[PDB]
DNA sequence: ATTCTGCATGGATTG
DNA sequence: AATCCATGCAGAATC
């Protein structure tokens, strides 16, 4: 159960827009590498083992890339998360299932 | 009249 | 001193 990264949800991530940005460094060290901009359907599951499915994609951004998970709103809702709170990611050694954790802020 | 969508921009933040 | 990333935004769909 290797843990990978953490990200405090900003207003845009926790809002209903539907897109949680991933830190470029994080998304590139820990999520599958993506060649094309459309990206990969990425299957995470939460602490209750419910499998949610996001779209892991990027956009161009000053010749760099900007990585984002789309489709996040119902899952974040299900954790009763809001901005300030932090979301976390981990992996499981066999099969590499990516697991989403969260913790609320003080 | 409201949500997708595919990016830009510039204060932060990092190197 | 360079490149993030939180969010603005303008057009296309959609209510």
Swiss-Prot record:
Compartments, record wording: Nucleus
Residue ranges of the annotated DNA-binding region, renumbered to this chain: 5-106
Signal sequence extent: none
Domain of life: Eukaryota
Tissue expression: Expressed in flowers and at lower levels in roots, stems and leaves.
Function: Transcriptional repressor of gene expression involved in embryonic pathways, such as LEC1, ABI3, and FUS3. Repressor of the sugar-inducible genes involved in the seed maturation program in seedlings. Plays an essential role in regulating the transition from seed maturation to seedling growth. Functionally redundant with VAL2/HSL1.
Quaternary assembly: Interacts with SNL1.
Protein name: B3 domain-containing transcription repressor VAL1
Phylogenetic placement of the source organism: Eukaryota, Viridiplantae, Streptophyta, Embryophyta, Tracheophyta
Residues of the full protein shown: 291 to 396 of 790
């Amino acid at each position: 159960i290797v843990p990978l990264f953490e990200k405090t949800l900003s207003a845009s991530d926790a809002g209903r827009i539907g897109r949680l940005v991933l830190p470029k460094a994080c998304a590139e060290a820990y999520f599958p590498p993506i060649s094309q901009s459309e990206g990969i359907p990425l299957k995470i599951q939460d602490v209750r083992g419910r499998e949610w499915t996001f779209q892991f994609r990027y956009w161009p951004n000053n010749n760099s890339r900007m990585y984002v998970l789309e489709g996040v709103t119902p899952c974040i809702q299900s954790m009763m998360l809001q901005a300030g709170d932090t979301v976390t990611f981990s992996r499981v050694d066999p099969g590499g299932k990516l697991i989403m954790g969260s913790r609320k802020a003080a």
